[PDB]
Amino acid sequence: MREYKLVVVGSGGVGKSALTVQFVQGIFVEKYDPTIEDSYRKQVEVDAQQCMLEILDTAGTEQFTAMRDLYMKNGQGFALVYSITAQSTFNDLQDLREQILRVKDTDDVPMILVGNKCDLEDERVVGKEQGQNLARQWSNCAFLESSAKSKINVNEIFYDLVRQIN
């Protein structure tokens, strides 16, 4: 079966691990905090085509990891995750995307912008329109707001990222 190597990236605390585990295992991590940059596997069907996904849950950008350029070079698609409750995590993604494009030496990289923690509407600081315009600035319409906690758009992040690699 075709296998896709996906990479979830973003600043600390945005819910990279929570999204990955919710998608792959169907459970919410609550306060459990994985300390390994591990890979998580799930078979999916997207547009009537079967795919094995292997999803790498990376450390927050501000944390040490010597493997970063390896994952940026080798990953087939990237989920760039921020929290809607922290503008810094959103702005951080501009530099992050630039780093990925630099490592790959091309603009043509499957990517989805993900505003996580959308269940925290009362704590929102990043407007949905901000996310939409960032996507527009990137010339890539793939943008979702998600909640790992409430299971909103979690599967769709990965399905939509697969659509781009296909």
Ligand SMILES: Nc1nc2c(ncn2[C@@H]2O[C@H](COP(=O)(O)OP(=O)(O)NP(=O)(O)O)[C@@H](O)[C@H]2O)c(=O)[nH]1
């Ligand atoms: N309300 C809410 N909380 C969330 C969501 N996702 C994650 N969290 C919470 O946010 C905290 C950090 O989540 P986690 O998945 O560990 O984030 P991370 O991006 O993997 N952090 P790190 O970069 O350090 O590995 C946890 O308390 C977690 O329960 C969400 O969609 N909604």
Ligand SMILES: [Mg+2]
């Ligand atoms: Mg994590």
